[PDB]
Design a protein around this ligand. Structure first.
Ligand code: HEM
Ligand SMILES: CC(C)(C)OC(=O)N[C@@H](CS[C@H](Cc1ccccc1)C(=O)NCc1cccnc1)Cc1ccccc1
Length: 454
């Protein structure tokens, strides 16, 4: 069989069913299954997504070795994913030297210096956010954060990636908003894990998990802008300026544009929802932050790149949220060679997995781990936190390239919104929040809260 491998290496795990492997155990979802396995088996364990062996690892030295020490050499790519179509060229899907080349060609886009240049742009839609929120707070109707934050995240994306400027909550039907707004335990991807041999089938059928129509709209919408700016501060331009030299192709450039939307749309919006839920169910933290924000920005002063880094309690709130809700859930690299790391034989072809969610909630590193307690990130206690236990942006050469941009994007939305409003539970607010038993880190029920004007 293929299912004998962990039994042979003396590695414990749950016993796999033929063909299926352990996937029925995802019925309660990745994270609950990860927690269970941690408790039941210890520091290392194995399971099978279908015939695919996955070794979980939770020792910080070993995690360091995989994520940083042996990245370029051994643990370079994520778990194969498909069908992708032309998206094979997206950085996050790309493999080995094409990844190394893409990552280089795109790293200077995400510098502090280029980020500081984008703060004015990400600020103006904080204002747009307020005015849409006020229209909902002067009419004391409970608000669904995912639509209004979704509208906001969506606003920052189009602006920061193509210079297109819209109020997606208000022009929700402009052509540029439709395509762009468009789960690994849904019927489709569970089937991909049992029948991964079916991927090269869909590839030759140009069936793509990225719908073939959105990809066509932006391939052409990009080339319109490309040739309307060429010739006559955003991500697209920064990429156009890069291929003005091994340099970035034209279809390669459309693909990265798409990964950036997918990356910062549901994530920026989802995280902000998780932070407003905790702010509302912990109103002292909410007050403590409103004070810190008014002290650095008095009279509702507009935030700047520099003032944002000045805020310590703000950063603590963000970091403690991502501890409870690390939206990647897991990190993963494919072992490309027989290797021994930190005293353990890892055979070629195993997927190596770091169960972030489960370690963020591990009582052996965290006190009262399910309690929302920002103080664990105080300049006092922030030093007692293992950066290979807390990894909401991954770690090493393949960590989240957009990390600085995402923290800034979120913090700008939070500052402007707590400058103006307070957030209180409704009776229809789900307390305590229940995580989706599905395949995405998101709430069972969408977070609804009451909004009031300061
Ligand atoms: C709060 C929001 C976000 C979180 C928590 C987050 C988290 C992550 C994590 C955990 C990874 C994988 C890291 C690893 O495997 O070690 C990742 C990868 C990535 N993220 Fe983010 N991310 C966020 C937002 C963004 C944004 C806004 C962008 C915008 C460009 C972005 C672009 C990427 C890319 C391109 C990768 C793949 C990097 C590579 O393989 O070279 N992400 N993110
Ligand atoms: C089947 C299996 C689970 C093994 O593989 C994958 O999920 N791998 C992805 C390709 S790695 C990359 C990193 C990533 C993936 C999934 C969750 C978090 C981070 C990616 O794509 N980040 C878009 C994005 C999201 C959040 C933060 N930053 C970036 C496929 C993909 C997902 C979503 C949009 C586009 C592509």
């Amino acid at each position: 069989h293929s299912h004998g491998l962990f039994k042979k290496l003396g590695i414990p795990g749950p016993t796999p069913l033929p063909f299926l492997g352990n996937i029925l155990s995802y019925h309660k979802g990745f994270c609950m299954f990860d927690m269970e396995c941690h408790k039941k088996y210890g520091k290392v364990w194995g399971f099978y997504d279908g015939q695919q062996p996955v070794l979980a690892i939770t020792d910080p030295d070993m995690i360091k070795t995989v994520l940083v020490k042996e990245c370029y050499s051994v643990f370079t790519n994520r778990r194969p994913f498909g069908p992708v179509g032309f998206m094979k060229s997206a950085i996050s899907i790309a493999e080995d030297e094409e990844w190394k080349r893409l990552r280089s060609l795109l790293s200077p886009t995400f510098t502090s210096g280029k980020l500081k240049e984008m703060v004015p742009i990400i600020a103006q839609y904080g204002d747009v956010l307020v005015r849409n929120l006020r229209r909902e707070a002067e009419t004391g109707k409970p608000v669904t954060l995912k639509d209004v934050f979704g509208a906001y995240s969506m606003d920052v994306i189009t602006s920061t990636s193509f210079g297109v400027n819209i109020d997606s909550l208000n022009n929700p039907q402009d052509p540029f908003v439709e395509n762009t707004k468009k789960d690994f335990l849904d019927p489709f991807f569970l089937s991909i894990t049992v029948f991964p041999f079916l991927i090269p089938i869909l590839e030759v059928l140009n069936i793509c998990v990225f719908p073939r129509e959105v990809t066509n709209f932006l391939r052409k919408s990009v080339k319109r802008m490309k040739e309307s700016r060429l010739e006559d501060v955003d991500f697209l331009q920064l990429m156009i300026d890069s291929q003005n030299s091994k340099a970035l192709s034209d279809l390669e450039l459309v693909a990265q544009s798409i990964i950036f939307i997918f990356a910062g749309y549901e994530t920026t919006s989802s995280v902000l929802s998780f932070i407003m839920y905790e702010l509302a169910t912990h109103p002292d933290v909410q007050q403590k932050l409103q004070e810190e924000i008014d002290a650095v920005l008095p009279n509702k002063a507009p935030p700047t790149y520099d003032t944002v880094l000045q805020m310590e309690y703000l950063d603590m709130v963000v970091n403690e949220t991502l501890r409870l809700f690390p939206i990647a859930m897991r990190l993963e690299r494919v072992c490309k060679k027989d290797v021994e790391i930190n005293g353990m034989f890892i055979p070629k072809g195993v997927v190596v997995m770091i169960p972030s969610y489960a370690l963020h909630r591990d009582p052996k590193y965290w006190t009262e781990p399910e309690k929302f307690l920002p103080e664990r990130f105080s300049k006092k206690n922030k030093d007692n936190i293992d950066p290979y236990i807390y990894t909401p942006f991954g770690s090493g050469p393949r960590n989240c390239i957009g990390m600085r941009f995402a923290l800034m994007n979120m913090k700008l939305a939070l500052i402007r919104v707590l400058q103006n409003f307070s957030f209180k539970p409704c009776k229809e607010t789900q307390i305590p929040l229940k995580l989706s038993l599905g395949g995405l880190l998101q709430p069972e029920k969408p977070v609804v809260l009451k909004v009031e004007s300061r």
